Amino acid sequence: VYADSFVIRGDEVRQIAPGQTGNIADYNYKLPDDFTGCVIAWNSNKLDS
Amino acid sequence: FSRLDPPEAEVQIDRLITGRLQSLQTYVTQQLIRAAEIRASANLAATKM
Structure with a gap:
């Protein structure tokens, strides 16, 4: 298993x-077409602002 | 492949490649019926001659 940690701007999480x-x-991280494993995303408007 | 999601496109092409193969699968079955009908007459033709 592996883990990543990003900062996005709003709408382009989808x-x-x-x-x-x-x-x-x-021009950044791009997922492949055989993605096994998945995404844990929340609303972190509490720390990184 | 022009606009769809590539995992969704492979699902979309799965229902199309099965439809094209079922038309070919029907065709091979139809020739097998017709090959048995001519063989019933070819063995009659060899019986005649």
């Missing part, structure tokens, strides 16, 4: 997905 593109899915 583009973190096996295949979809966007702003930070082309």
Whole structure:
């Protein structure tokens, strides 16, 4: 198993997905098309601001 | 593949590649019926000659 830790800006969490593109899915981290393992995402408007 | 999700596109092409294969699977079955009908007459033709 492996773990990552990002900071996103709002709406483009939905583009973190096996295949979809966007702003930070082309010049940043991009998921592959055979993604086994998945995503734990919450609302951290409490620390990183 | 132009706009769909590539995991969803492989599901979409699965229902299309099975539909194209079922048309071919039906065709091989239809020739097997027709090959048995001619063989019933070819063995009659060899019986005649």
